[PDB]
Design a protein around this motif. Structure first.
Motif, PDB file in Angstrom:
ATOM      1  N   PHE A 212       0.827  -1.201   0.000  1.00 53.23           N
ATOM      2  CA  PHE A 212       0.000   0.000   0.000  1.00 53.23           C
ATOM      3  C   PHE A 212       0.866   1.256   0.000  1.00 53.23           C
ATOM      4  N   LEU A 213       1.992   1.193   0.703  1.00 47.10           N
ATOM      5  CA  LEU A 213       2.907   2.325   0.786  1.00 47.10           C
ATOM      6  C   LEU A 213       4.321   1.912   0.388  1.00 47.10           C
ATOM      7  N   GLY A 214       4.920   1.029   1.182  1.00 44.87           N
ATOM      8  CA  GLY A 214       6.265   0.566   0.895  1.00 44.87           C
ATOM      9  C   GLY A 214       6.709  -0.540   1.830  1.00 44.87           C
ATOM     10  N   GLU A 215       7.999  -0.864   1.792  1.00 43.90           N
ATOM     11  CA  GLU A 215       8.547  -1.914   2.642  1.00 43.90           C
ATOM     12  C   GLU A 215       9.287  -1.316   3.835  1.00 43.90           C
ATOM     13  N   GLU A 216       8.837  -1.663   5.037  1.00 38.68           N
ATOM     14  CA  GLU A 216       9.455  -1.160   6.258  1.00 38.68           C
ATOM     15  C   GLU A 216       9.249  -2.134   7.413  1.00 38.68           C
ATOM     16  N   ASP A 217       9.717  -1.748   8.596  1.00 36.24           N
ATOM     17  CA  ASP A 217       9.583  -2.586   9.782  1.00 36.24           C
ATOM     18  C   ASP A 217       8.114  -2.843  10.104  1.00 36.24           C
ATOM     19  N   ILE A 218       7.865  -3.448  11.260  1.00 37.38           N
ATOM     20  CA  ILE A 218       6.503  -3.750  11.685  1.00 37.38           C
ATOM     21  C   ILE A 218       5.843  -4.752  10.744  1.00 37.38           C
ATOM     22  N   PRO A 219       6.212  -6.034  10.889  1.00 39.09           N
ATOM     23  CA  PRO A 219       5.666  -7.113  10.062  1.00 39.09           C
ATOM     24  C   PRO A 219       4.201  -7.398  10.374  1.00 39.09           C
ATOM     25  N   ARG A 220       3.820  -7.206  11.633  1.00 33.52           N
ATOM     26  CA  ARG A 220       2.447  -7.443  12.060  1.00 33.52           C
ATOM     27  C   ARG A 220       1.465  -6.655  11.198  1.00 33.52           C
ATOM     28  N   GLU A 221       0.826  -7.344  10.258  1.00 35.24           N
ATOM     29  CA  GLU A 221      -0.137  -6.707   9.366  1.00 35.24           C
ATOM     30  C   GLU A 221      -1.481  -6.517  10.064  1.00 35.24           C
ATOM     31  N   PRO A 222      -2.300  -5.599   9.529  1.00 31.21           N
ATOM     32  CA  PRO A 222      -3.623  -5.300  10.083  1.00 31.21           C
ATOM     33  C   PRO A 222      -4.611  -6.445   9.875  1.00 31.21           C
ATOM     34  N   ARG A 223      -5.500  -6.636  10.844  1.00 32.20           N
ATOM     35  CA  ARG A 223      -6.497  -7.697  10.766  1.00 32.20           C
ATOM     36  C   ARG A 223      -7.760  -7.314  11.533  1.00 32.20           C
ATOM     37  N   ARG A 224      -8.915  -7.603  10.943  1.00 27.70           N
ATOM     38  CA  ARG A 224     -10.193  -7.288  11.570  1.00 27.70           C
ATOM     39  C   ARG A 224     -10.558  -8.335  12.618  1.00 27.70           C
ATOM     40  N   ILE A 225     -10.902  -7.871  13.815  1.00 27.08           N
ATOM     41  CA  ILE A 225     -11.274  -8.768  14.902  1.00 27.08           C
ATOM     42  C   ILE A 225     -12.779  -8.740  15.149  1.00 27.08           C
ATOM     43  N   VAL A 226     -13.365  -9.918  15.332  1.00 29.01           N
ATOM     44  CA  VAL A 226     -14.799 -10.029  15.580  1.00 29.01           C
ATOM     45  C   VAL A 226     -15.129  -9.714  17.035  1.00 29.01           C
ATOM     46  N   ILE A 227     -16.128  -8.862  17.237  1.00 30.69           N
ATOM     47  CA  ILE A 227     -16.544  -8.480  18.581  1.00 30.69           C
ATOM     48  C   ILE A 227     -18.060  -8.544  18.724  1.00 30.69           C
ATOM     49  N   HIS A 228     -18.525  -8.794  19.946  1.00 33.02           N
ATOM     50  CA  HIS A 228     -19.955  -8.878  20.218  1.00 33.02           C
ATOM     51  C   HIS A 228     -20.623  -7.519  20.041  1.00 33.02           C
ATOM     52  N   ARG A 229     -21.948  -7.497  20.145  1.00 29.98           N
ATOM     53  CA  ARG A 229     -22.706  -6.261  19.995  1.00 29.98           C
ATOM     54  C   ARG A 229     -22.011  -5.107  20.710  1.00 29.98           C
ATOM     55  N   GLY A 230     -21.655  -4.075  19.952  1.00 31.19           N
ATOM     56  CA  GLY A 230     -20.988  -2.924  20.530  1.00 31.19           C
ATOM     57  C   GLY A 230     -21.726  -2.368  21.732  1.00 31.19           C
ATOM     58  N   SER A 231     -23.039  -2.574  21.765  1.00 31.64           N
ATOM     59  CA  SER A 231     -23.863  -2.085  22.864  1.00 31.64           C
ATOM     60  C   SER A 231     -23.281  -2.510  24.209  1.00 31.64           C
ATOM     61  N   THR A 232     -22.691  -3.701  24.241  1.00 27.32           N
ATOM     62  CA  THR A 232     -22.095  -4.226  25.464  1.00 27.32           C
ATOM     63  C   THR A 232     -20.574  -4.236  25.375  1.00 27.32           C
ATOM     64  N   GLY A 233     -20.026  -3.332  24.568  1.00 27.53           N
ATOM     65  CA  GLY A 233     -18.586  -3.254  24.410  1.00 27.53           C
ATOM     66  C   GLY A 233     -17.952  -2.253  25.355  1.00 27.53           C
ATOM     67  N   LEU A 234     -18.214  -2.414  26.648  1.00 25.02           N
ATOM     68  CA  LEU A 234     -17.666  -1.515  27.657  1.00 25.02           C
ATOM     69  C   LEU A 234     -16.362  -2.065  28.226  1.00 25.02           C
ATOM     70  N   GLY A 235     -16.206  -3.385  28.168  1.00 25.20           N
ATOM     71  CA  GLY A 235     -15.002  -4.013  28.678  1.00 25.20           C
ATOM     72  C   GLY A 235     -13.740  -3.345  28.169  1.00 25.20           C
ATOM     73  N   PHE A 236     -13.766  -2.913  26.913  1.00 29.67           N
ATOM     74  CA  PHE A 236     -12.614  -2.256  26.306  1.00 29.67           C
ATOM     75  C   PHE A 236     -12.777  -0.739  26.332  1.00 29.67           C
ATOM     76  N   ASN A 237     -11.662  -0.028  26.203  1.00 28.36           N
ATOM     77  CA  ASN A 237     -11.679   1.431  26.212  1.00 28.36           C
ATOM     78  C   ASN A 237     -10.959   1.991  24.990  1.00 28.36           C
ATOM     79  N   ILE A 238     -11.156   3.280  24.732  1.00 25.09           N
ATOM     80  CA  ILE A 238     -10.523   3.937  23.596  1.00 25.09           C
ATOM     81  C   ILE A 238      -9.827   5.225  24.022  1.00 25.09           C
ATOM     82  N   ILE A 239      -8.647   5.467  23.463  1.00 25.61           N
ATOM     83  CA  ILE A 239      -7.881   6.664  23.783  1.00 25.61           C
ATOM     84  C   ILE A 239      -7.381   7.352  22.517  1.00 25.61           C
ATOM     85  N   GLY A 240      -7.476   8.679  22.494  1.00 22.36           N
ATOM     86  CA  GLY A 240      -7.028   9.434  21.339  1.00 22.36           C
ATOM     87  C   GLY A 240      -6.635  10.855  21.691  1.00 22.36           C
TER      88      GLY A 240
END
Length: 102
Positions: free
Chosen positions: A1-29
């Motif tokens: 998509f851009l080029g070749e660099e470090d960080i081999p861990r590629e992006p991947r979509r993770i399955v999660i239950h109804r977001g309505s009950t997605g309080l266990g996790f938090n978000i920071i920005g």
């Protein structure tokens, strides 16, 4: 998509239950969505058990909509209206998140 660099861990979509009950996790920005990433996992949560997401991981997009430039609260909006399941992309980014924890 851009080029070749470090960080081999590629992006991947993770399955999660109804977001309505997605309080266990938090978000920071920051401002103007400078960079929103996973904060921390709470054991017992749906995303914690169903998903393998953990602190340090970076969020690229959720249930389609991209949150690469989404503010801190702006990201929550996507998670709130997630629905039955929200596909969140995770990618090894300890340095990116490290910016928050100092």
């Amino acid at each position: 998509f851009l080029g070749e660099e470090d960080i081999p861990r590629e992006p991947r979509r993770i399955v999660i239950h109804r977001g309505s009950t997605g309080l266990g996790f938090n978000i920071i920005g920051g401002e103007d969505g400078e960079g929103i990433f996973i904060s921390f996992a709470l054991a017992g949560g749906p995303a914690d058990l169903s998903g393998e997401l953990r602190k340090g991981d970076q969020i690229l997009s959720v249930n389609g909509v991209d949150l690469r430039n989404a503010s801190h609260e702006q990201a929550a909006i996507a998670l709130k209206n997630a629905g039955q399941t929200v596909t969140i992309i995770a990618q090894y980014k300890p340095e990116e998140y490290s910016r928050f924890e100092a």
